[PDB]
Amino acid sequence: CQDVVQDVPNVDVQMLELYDRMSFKDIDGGVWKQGWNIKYDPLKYNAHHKLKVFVVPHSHNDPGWIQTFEEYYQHDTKHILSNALRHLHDNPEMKFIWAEISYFARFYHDLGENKKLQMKSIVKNGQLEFVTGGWVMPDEANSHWRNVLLQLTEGQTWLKQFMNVTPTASWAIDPFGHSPTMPYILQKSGFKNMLIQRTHYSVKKELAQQRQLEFLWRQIWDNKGDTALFTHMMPFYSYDIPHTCGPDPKVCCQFDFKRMGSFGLSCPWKVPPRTISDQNVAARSDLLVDQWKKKAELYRTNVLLIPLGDDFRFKQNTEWDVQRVNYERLFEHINSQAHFNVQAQFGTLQEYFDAVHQAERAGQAEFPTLSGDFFTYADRSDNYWSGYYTSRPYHKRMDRVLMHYVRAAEMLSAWHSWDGMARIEERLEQARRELSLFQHHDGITGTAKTHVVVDYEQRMQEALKACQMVMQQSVYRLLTKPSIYSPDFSFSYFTLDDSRWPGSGVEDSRTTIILGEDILPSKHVVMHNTLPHWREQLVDFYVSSPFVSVTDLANNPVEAQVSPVWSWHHDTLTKTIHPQGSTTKYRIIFKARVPPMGLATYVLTISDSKPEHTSYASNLLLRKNPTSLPLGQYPEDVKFGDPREISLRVGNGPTLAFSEQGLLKSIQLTQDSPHVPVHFKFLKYGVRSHGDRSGAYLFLPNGPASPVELGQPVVLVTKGKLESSVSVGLPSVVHQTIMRGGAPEIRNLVDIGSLDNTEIVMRLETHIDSGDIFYTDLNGLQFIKRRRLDKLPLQANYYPIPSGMFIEDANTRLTLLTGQPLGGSSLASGELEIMQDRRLASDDERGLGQGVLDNKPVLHIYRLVLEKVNNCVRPSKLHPAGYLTSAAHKASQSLLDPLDKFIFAENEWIGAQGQFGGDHPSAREDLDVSVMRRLTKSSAKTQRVGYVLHRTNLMQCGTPEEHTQKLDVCHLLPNVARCERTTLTFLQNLEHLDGMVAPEVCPMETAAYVSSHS
Ligand SMILES: *[C@@H]1O[C@H](CO)[C@@H](O)[C@H](O)[C@H]1NC(C)=O
């Protein structure tokens, strides 16, 4: 295994280093506004060395943006694909590339058999070529790597089954900035090439000047280079025709033949395209070839890529004709005029890459190596696209919830083969597809119109329900005596109880377990642990009585804590935000211990009085002018007092101190250690009254954030043996700090209400001497080193925080893990900040046509880990990566993949079993079974189950960390006949494993295995 910590990779271009050296000056470079006047030697190409030009027709189809997926399909896409089929069929030399499989599948299944065959033929013959082949072209900033893989697999599995093809070239022309997580996954999925477009204009200029636009992109920790994937970065401002033929859009626009008038399009540079004729072809060709040769100067081979397309292009038959005919005339002339020394033709993306590598093998070009990412993107001036790291945070959080539900549903149902009547495969396909669709760069990004966001939400809600159905049916089968099991595949044996989604104060969705002497004495509950190691976690349920005790199935008492059910309300009368307690519902909390990838059953029983093994939390309401707070049957009376500083400690965990405003002030790790200053503060960013305004994409603050006026907020302190908390009702945010014995959990119920042109940020202030360095993760896969650059505006220093961020000095580190992707930064030494929500009244001129005024309450969750790191073996000062500690990694897992809770619906569960998976191996803490999916339906003689195994890299800080079993996923199911290593999509077999044993992977590696069972 490669050492991902101590060996700094030697690469030609390291993005953090490049950023440190670049000046980012935004000067007018001429016709190529952000470049320079390209010059070339006409004698460079000749009869013995011609410029090969591939014009690649394409159509960018957004699976939702200003219209819903279905609206675009009906109005545009079905026509684009229908006419593509006809035109390609009738013109053998014409070519076309397609990226969005969600749309292609929607189209293909509606086609008659005759047309399906014609479609398969033009794909088989190479006229229509799929690029990437994912369900969508995903966002690369907010997306979790697990979902990027999910959507890629969804699209490619469909392509293999119906088109009999698997793309090895990727096309990503629209994500707002690019992540190395893409080549990571792609390279492990059979890919050999990839193309990107939206990178900072300064970066394009810098790399263009050194002809480093094509490079071998390797991971930041990869010293050997085995993760490298050839990457092509487009050099200009856009992927549209005016910015893809050469450096001068005024000239290139004249070669977009759809802009002559009848199509309602024109050229903003004032010179319209002109139909090619024998009379003007010589002059037209001279202009075009000149542009091509200028573009060619920016690359190293004699093979040039010229994309020909735009948003939803090639829709009308007349459009296909106008583009094809005019280009055909240009090709005939150019290719017949030796003085040009050019051979141009329509081509596909793969054809371009094949030619490039042929030139490379011929030894005419050597490519540079590169590591790093391409955030934060700016398309012009100071317009940095960091706003979408936070836009529509409700759905960003929903993404992570559904991500987990999909994993749990696929895993729980994978243990058995199901009869078709159970509709398991049907529900799982629906769930995977709705989640996959949301990975779109206008989905999770929060950059779609309001009604489109609603469509995505509805789709995900249906996916969540599908997931619940599959999960509960699976639990019933896994924990019921075989000879008693009698399933009704439409019946709900269990109801899922989720305490953090939609969340308290967001939607009263979770059910109350109703117990009573005259109705029902007890209730069975079951917890699922999707992680491959034994796990303990506190779980809570709402019960109709405070006198409830918990037992495991062996009837062993389990220590429990009962607390009130508190809800915060914006009192319109008193003009205050205060909590009200329920007098009929209560929260029971207890520690559940669940097997690796298993289930554990517990029983809740009511009694007439306080049970021996259940304790009750004390409650203290701090504020002036308090009023009574009755809690019905709740044992202890609420206490009151004027606001004051408080200190709390649960178990042997840390001791936290809070200000009289209910905000964290310090953390004391041990009784001996000191009180380390760690202050939570909420501030607000505004919008500029002059110039460019912030919108769904852009973050254009009117200066540093201003503190939110808190006044004298109401603070609620709940102290219990198992769980304690401090909650405060601040303007726009009910902030909560929860303690359960380890790193605290932070929950923010964010309701920005009607505060227009405001962005609410949560900041942490410490004494950590971090300087200008901080770390943020990329797609929940890796942590990359960031350097605050004062030479860039505030918004440029904001980065995606898909799952976590941290700052550190020689001795201390503070890590904030998130349960949702949001934007964040470290604007000063010792600080960490992350945006909660943003409400913007104006549009930011990127085509959305609206601001962001559809905010809704969202419950954001986090874990805050303060640690001493002076003893940890960390990367050298020059290493571009960072790594989490065991505690921080586990805290992240507690947020993204918590235990699942099921409540038995009926009064009695006959044949109930107390546990499943007690014999499953408990794998090393850094290893995870990211995916477990049965790949075959019940009718298959040989069943196949696929697994995606990921091993992260945790810092070694002197902790023994022992007793763990080797995890062989191929033997998790009985009767294994063969074990194979496959691409991450499970589509290609890479190795036949001897002994049918799937070996564990190396740190930072991800592998896929498929076990076959007779
Ligand atoms: C799929 O493509 C492969 C190309 O290697 C070919 O051998 C095979 O016959 C094709 N199968 C079909 C008909 O889908």
Ligand SMILES: [Zn+2]
């Ligand atoms: Zn797009």
